[PDB]
Amino acid sequence: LQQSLELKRKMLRDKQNKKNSGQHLPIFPAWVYERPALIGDFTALPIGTLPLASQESAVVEDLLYVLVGVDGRYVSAQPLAGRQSRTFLVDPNLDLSIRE
């Protein structure tokens, strides 16, 4: 994540000095970091107190949202907003057979 930003500039610099016909090489615009143009992948009730035939429909619908990398409703995507790691938290009081 952070290590890339270095390499990219230096690989530019090798090719400005080797080519004497290289002209107006770009700078990466600032707004792409200030405003999201790279990453786009980044009420809440306890599921254990709910009836059964609402718990099944609800946990299926919420986990389907959760898979993409962002919060669903009763399962949350834990914030890291970065590297190859991501963990999700389903509510701890879900019935043990369904939660496993």
Add this chain to the structure above:
Amino acid sequence: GHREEPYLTEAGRDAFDKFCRLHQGELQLLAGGVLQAPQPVLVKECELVKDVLNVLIGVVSATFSLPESISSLLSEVAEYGT
């Protein structure tokens, strides 16, 4: 009419639990109090079926670690999940 007064085999589902409870009273008096039997119900049939099924999922459960004869049926199917 009042009925034809049930036999032992015809009596059941209440008289079975009753007959079990009386057998447990018999065992506890003939022991002296060095056994301590638990509740035969809780777990019932379906609760126990789900508890053993969780071990076939691949994680242990309430009576597992890594109606009084139900233990004898139980061990045979408990060993497979463990």
